[model samples]
Target chain A: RIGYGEDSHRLEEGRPLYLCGLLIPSPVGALAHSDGDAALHALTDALLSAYGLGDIGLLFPDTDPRWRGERSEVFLREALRLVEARGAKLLQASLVLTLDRPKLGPHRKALVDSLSRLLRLPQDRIGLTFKTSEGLAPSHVQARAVVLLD
Target chain B: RIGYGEDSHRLEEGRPLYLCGLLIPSPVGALAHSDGDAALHALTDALLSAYGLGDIGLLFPDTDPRWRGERSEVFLREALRLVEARGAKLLQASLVLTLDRPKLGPHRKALVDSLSRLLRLPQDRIGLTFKTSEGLAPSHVQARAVVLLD
Candidate 1:
């Protein structure tokens, strides 16, 4: 089975930036209700969508008190658990993160390592790619993810 | 194998709208150099990236005379051929298209049919989702795609 998911958030100064479950130093971060880790949110949605479940907003709405202060990794792990309950084994994940500032090239290894530990997949299977918005969305951080399952 | 790809183009009036290889009735269309079919372009890139091949710009640059007047489907088919040549059998494709105007809900069947015909996959295997930009990118059309291969 295969699934695709996407997420984007407007950037704002003074907020902490997070991607692939790691907090990165940046001048601006996602302006979102949760931790605003767009990478994990996209991956979480991809895992749920693969089994025809639901998206992050539907499953982990910020309005819900149970998830109000929860971390993005919790959402991702819950989605992975839900999919595994349905007998789906996640084989691999390919993710692309788009941001203009705080050049990600220097932190590729850390980002990929975080994703590897979270998804329980090897470095080679993670397929993490970083790209700049090319002046199109300099004030936003976007993530697109694809997951394969058995 | 799983691959993820994304493409976005600014929208402009007077241009024709094309999605999934079918011309869409819309007041504004993608302002791009190559028919600007973001959906097909994303899918093509996903197919290529599955095997570590370069993106659309690298493989089918508009500067190249051989691809100057070619349709987006030509690019898609060529990517499929290249992946198949490496013994990759595409299993399914899941795509999301985001636009604010010309509601796509009405054209779901036609769009899915077009994708089915173009990718040679059954309707069940081709997952197509439509979404509005929700004011974030009212002047842009964006596509994200994921492909599974065996």
Candidate 2:
């Protein structure tokens, strides 16, 4: 099974920008309802999607005070647990992130390594690509995640 | 194998919104060369991407008159055939759509059922989600798809 997910957050000042758990230094960070790790959120959603599980919102609606400021990696781990319970194992995962500011090229390896540790997938199995939207919004971070389940 | 695909279209008045082969009532429609169903288009691209088949543009470019105003479901079926020929079966598919207007909650079930029939998968195998940009673009419909093949 293949699952796909995407997420975006408005850019804001003061907060840190976290991608796959790697905190990259940036002038502006994602203004999110949670920890605002768009990449992890999208990845979590993809894992859930492949199994017909509802998205992150269904599990962690911002409205619930219990989920306020929750870390997105927690969501990804939970989704992984759900997939395991269903007897599905992830084969591989690929991702593309679209944003204009704070080039990711410099931090690509660290970001990939971080996710590799979290997902237990080899660095080679996790593919990451960065793209710029040119002038799409004042600032926003969007990520696309694809996962294969076996 | 796993594949990831993303697509977007500007919104226009008068056109109808087609998502996952189901037409949804909307005040604005996607401005597209084909039916402008971003969901199916993204899914098609994901299937091809997994096999290094390039993208939908490579097979059905907008410049080709034959694809103009064509139904996106046809493209998805063709992609599936190609995947099968490569000795792979799509185990599951998941997707997320981003749009600012037109609440999708009311029609989520219809869209899921429609894709389930088209893909010959149970309703539990197709995952669908809707999200908003929170003022990222003036008007746009975009979707990201992921597929798991075995």
The TM-score each candidate achieves on chain A is 0.98, 0.94
Best model number under TM-score: 2
State the displacement of the C-alpha of residue B118, model 2, in Å, after optimal TM-score superposition.
Answer: 1.1
Give per-residue lDDT, candidate 1, residue A129: 60
**What digit string (tens of lDDT, one per residue) describes model 2 on residues A18-92?**
888778888888887676788998899888887887788677787888677778888889999999899988888
Give a tens-digit lDDT track for model 1, residues A56-136.
Answer: 889999889988989999999999999999999988888878888878767777888898899998765676666555467
Q: What is the DockQ of candidate 1?
A: 0.20
Q: Which runs in model 2 stand beyond 4 Å of their true positions?
A: A103-110, A122-124, A129-138, B1-6, B32-34, B44-71, B74-90, B148-150
Cα-based TM-score, every candidate: 0.64, 0.79
Q: Model 2: per-residue lDDT, tens digit, B1-150? A: 888788899989888999898888999898877888999999999999999988888888767877656799988888888888988787777888889888887787788888888888887788887788767864999887767777
Worst 10 residues of 2 chain B by lDDT: B61-70
Candidate 2: docking tier: medium
Best by lDDT: 1
Which sections of candidate 1 miss by over 4 Å?
A: A1-90, A100-136
